[PDB]
């Protein structure tokens, strides 16, 4: 059982090794876009409530 778990951990470390680290700039751009979307949605919701 212990050797099987070790092999599984090796496989998982391999799959992690294949991966890379994402860029912060794109995440910041997406965050700003989502913030703008949220603001506009809030304004639309308030307008609908008043109507």
């Amino acid at each position: 059982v212990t050797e099987n778990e070790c092999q599984n951990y090796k496989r998982c470390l391999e799959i992690l090794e294949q991966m890379n680290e994402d860029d912060s700039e794109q995440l910041q751009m997406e965050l700003k876009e989502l913030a703008l979307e949220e603001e506009r949605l809030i304004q639309e919701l308030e307008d609908v409530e008043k109507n």
Partner: protein, 50 residues
């Protein structure tokens, strides 16, 4: 937002229907009142004749 918009649309439709109904009812009321006025005039004339 989508659910609220659906509710808004339903309310708008209902209000439009009610407004048109109110207009029709008012017109009918005015016509009926005018008819009553003329009828009473005719009744007075008939009283004189009798």
């Amino acid at each position: 937002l989508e659910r609220q918009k659906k509710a808004l649309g339903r309310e708008v439709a209902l209000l439009h229907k009610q407004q048109i109904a109110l207009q029709d009812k008012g017109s009918a009321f005015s016509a009926e009142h005018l008819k009553l006025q003329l009828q009473k005039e005719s009744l007075n004339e008939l009283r004189k004749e009798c």
